[PDB]
Design a protein around this ligand. Sequence first.
Ligand code: CU1
Length: 105
Amino acid sequence: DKATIPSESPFAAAEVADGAIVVDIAKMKYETPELHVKVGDTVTYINREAMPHNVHFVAGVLGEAALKGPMMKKEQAYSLTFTEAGTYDYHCTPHPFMRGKVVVE
Ligand SMILES: [Cu+]
């Protein structure tokens, strides 16, 4: 796998690390739909709205299997640590018109 998962559970927005790079989710959009990070960085998604959201990378993107993240309730967060350069597209499972990408460089 080209990413590791610190927490399989979502966790509270207050529990977000220092140093993680935050992507907020609100108004049915990922607020930073194109994020550029370095190898080794942790990206933390934070749901800021009532609608539950996840991030979903299809098979072959972050590793062999699809990475279907857990649903985040409002004010919950979920992190991924990227270990290899590349472009990693994702979408929201229930709302697949929501799309973003992480470019690791
Ligand atoms: Cu969503």
